[PDB]
């Protein structure tokens, strides 16, 4: 029971739309942790969300984005060892 299929769309020079899949009402919320590949930011959103628009980013920059399904105050040990994770690069130069 995990979030799957992290994809990006609506890529611009300072924004990226993230999208993922998870089984209906399996998690209370998701933790989205991102930073430039190399200070990390933690976003939390309701468990019914399957997309988020990351804004305020730098042009031509690669980010590391991890999404963790949250039950109560917990994340699965498997999901910490192998999170839904990906690098994405903004538009521009």
Q: Domains (ranges, CATH) in the chain? A: 1-93 (2.60.40.10)
Q: Which of 84, 54, 81 is nearest to 69 (CA)?
A: 84
Cβ neighbour number for residue 20 with a 10 Å cutoff? 20
Q: Which is it for the CA torsion 80, 86, 92, 93, positive or negative?
A: positive
Distance CA 25, CA 56 (A): 30
H or E element at residue 38: none
Experimental method for this entry? X-ray
Report the DSSP pairing between strands 62-70 and 16-21: unpaired
Within 8 A by CB and 6+ apart from 7, the residues are 18, 19, 20
What phi-psi label fits residue 12: left (phi over 0), alpha (psi between -120 and 50 degrees) or beta? beta
HSE toward the beta carbon, residue 9, CA cutoff 13 A: 7
Overall resolution, Å: 2.5
């Amino acid at each position: 029971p995990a979030p799957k299929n992290l994809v990006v769309s609506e890529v611009t020079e300072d924004s990226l739309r993230l999208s993922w899949t998870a089984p209906d009402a399996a998690f209370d919320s998701f933790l989205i942790q991102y930073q430039e590949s190399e200070e990390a930011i933690n976003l939390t959103v309701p468990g019914s969300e399957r997309s988020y628009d990351l804004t305020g980013l730098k042009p031509g920059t690669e980010y590391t984005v991890s999404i963790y399904g949250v039950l109560g105050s917990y994340v699965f040990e498997h999901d910490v060892m192998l999170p839904l994770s990906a690098e994405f690069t903004t538009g521009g130069h």
